[PDB]
Amino acid sequence: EVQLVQSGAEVKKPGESLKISCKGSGYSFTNYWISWVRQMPGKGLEWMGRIDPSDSYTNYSPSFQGHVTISADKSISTAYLQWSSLKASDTAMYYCARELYQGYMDTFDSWGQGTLVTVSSASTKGPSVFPLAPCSESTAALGCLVKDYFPEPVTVSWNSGALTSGVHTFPAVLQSSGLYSLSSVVTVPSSSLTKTYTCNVDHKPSNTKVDKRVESK
Amino acid sequence: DIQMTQSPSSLSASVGDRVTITCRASQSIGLYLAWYQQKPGKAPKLLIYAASSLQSGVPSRFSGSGSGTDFTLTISSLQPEDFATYYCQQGNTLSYTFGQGTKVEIKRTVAAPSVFIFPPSDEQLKSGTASVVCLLNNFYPREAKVQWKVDNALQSGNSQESVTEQDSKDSTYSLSSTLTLSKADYEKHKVYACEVTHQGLSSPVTKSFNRGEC
Ligand SMILES: [Zn+2]
Ligand SMILES: [Zn+2]
Ligand SMILES: [Zn+2]
Ligand SMILES: [Zn+2]
């Protein structure tokens, strides 16, 4: 099986150095070029550059020119992407890709699974969790506001995973502060508010966990 | 330096539809166009190369056409696993450049949001910040206008929103909007309102509460 596998996710501060990797297996590494592609959160794909692993010849986009160095180490069939000084603007998913020439063009026929790189001045912080209850019907909404954490992600469950139906946990937004925030809500029968509702908020990075009972009041 | 522009940016389609996505090159590029599909959280996947050559393993319901400046991707009978984002890429010259992508979403019938508003908790207010939350539940299509009014005055630049992906059961969206204020600003005003405009509503729906008296 042709297969490119990338190193793990990174959380870094601006000014730091980073080298991420991509190891090919199931083919002749020196025989196929390797492209790197940036995908910013919510955005499309950006070709950064390429390299012929056999002699380490490199091509860069006029955009990524100089700001990033691509390299190859055929000793153990591994390609590299590296920065000397990261900026918060470098925050993105990064994919390595195998260039397979066919029909007279270079095609990205095989892709690594992606490396998430988050760059921020912020420091690790568990979230505060606030109830979302209606002021003083058909369906009724209640929720939890999970505020001021870093980095992503948190996971929310309701009533220890006992409640999954009708829950929406929204994608996190990045605040001015550099900290994330997100809401989780659930709609329930208005004749239940009887039933107790508690959101469980787990934040692995801060090794932290918060249960919040959401009172009908 | 060849600009790749895809159309449309997004489209809704039903299972069994024929779907066409177009790609225009800022200059000629011959036949050197490739199509990629990407699902959320996953790496892209090659579908077509050389404008019309079907990549090994890819279902024949996928086909490409065009030459020079104009190219099309056709999906002849959309299957459930085809809802995704599609990228074209020119391979004429370096740098390699990708189109901005076309997202294929699921068509369904118009559905009006259920709307809810949530005051700040007392717990948050102690930290000295006030978050007001407005929720739009299960609506279709995605386009929705949410406006915050405080003391009946339109707010700007002090709120953020996010939207879910289409629900796996009913294919609707849900939306959350957050107005953030300092506790002292929060306490000066009385009336907090979320005004929602959307296709399935005859006219805007307003949800509100009065600070202190709730
Ligand atoms: Zn060479
Ligand atoms: Zn530059
Ligand atoms: Zn819902
Ligand atoms: Zn006022």
Whether B131 and B69 share a structural domain: no
Q: Tell me whether residues B95 and A45 touch, CB distance under 8 A.
A: no
d(CA A110, CA B196): 44
Best of A63, A132, A144, A169 to disrupt the B interface (most B CBs within 10 Å) is: A132
Identical fold between A1-121 and A122-217: yes
Q: Are the CB atoms for B4 and B101 separated by under 8 Å?
A: no
Q: Which two tokens stand for residue A103?
A: 């029909």
CATH of the domain at B40: 2.60.40.10
Whether B176 and B134 share a structural domain: yes
Whether B59 and B114 share a structural domain: no
Q: Are the CB atoms for B119 and B132 separated by under 8 Å?
A: yes
Whether B100 and B127 share a structural domain: no
- B138 to each of A137, A187, A190, B84, how far by Cα in Å? 17, 10, 17, 20
Instruction: Mention every residue, 6+ apart, whose C-beta is less than 8 A from residue A75.
Output: none
The closest CB to that of A44, out of B34, B100, B124, belongs to B100
Interface check for A162 against chain B (CB to CB < 8 A): the answer is: no
Domain stops at, among B107, B135, B151: B107
* Structural domain of B43: 1-107
H-only helix segments in chain B: 122-127, 183-188
Intra-chain end-to-end CA distance of chain A, in Å: 58
Chain B residues lying within 8 Å of A46, measured CB to CB = 98
- A11 to each of A121, A193, B91, B100, how far by Cα in Å? 10, 41, 33, 27
d(CA A112, CA A46): 15
Q: Which CATH architecture has domain A1-121?
A: Sandwich (2.60)
Burial class (CB in 10 A: 0-12, 13-18, 19+), B36: buried
Q: What experimental approach yielded this model?
A: X-ray
Torsions phi, psi of B187, nearest 5?
Answer: -85, -15
Interface check for B117 against chain A (CB to CB < 8 A): the answer is: yes
d(CA A82, CA A212): 42
Whether B88 and B39 share a structural domain: yes
With left for phi above 0 and alpha for psi between -120 and 50, is residue B168 left, alpha or beta?
alpha
Q: How many CB atoms are located within 10 Å of the residue B111 CB? A: 18
Q: Which two tokens stand for residue A89?
A: 């603007």
Q: Are the CB atoms for A129 and A23 separated by under 8 Å?
A: no
> Which numeric CATH code is attached to A122-217?
2.60.40.10
The residues spanned by each domain of chain A are 1-121, 122-217
Closest CA to A129 of A206, A209, A217: A209
Whether B154 and B94 share a structural domain: no
d(CA A193, CA A217): 10
Domain stops at, among B76, B107, B138: B107
Domain stops at, among B60, B84, B107: B107
Q: What is the DSSP string of B85-144?
A: EEEEEE-SSSSPEE---EEEEE----BPPEEEEEPPPHHHHHHTEEEEEEEEEEEBSS--
d(CA A185, CA A168): 5
Whether B84 and B36 share a structural domain: yes
Domain count of chain B? 2
Q: How many CB atoms are located within 10 Å of the residue A204 CB? A: 12
* SS3 of residue B150 by DSSP: strand
Q: Which two tokens stand for residue A95?
A: 């994919």
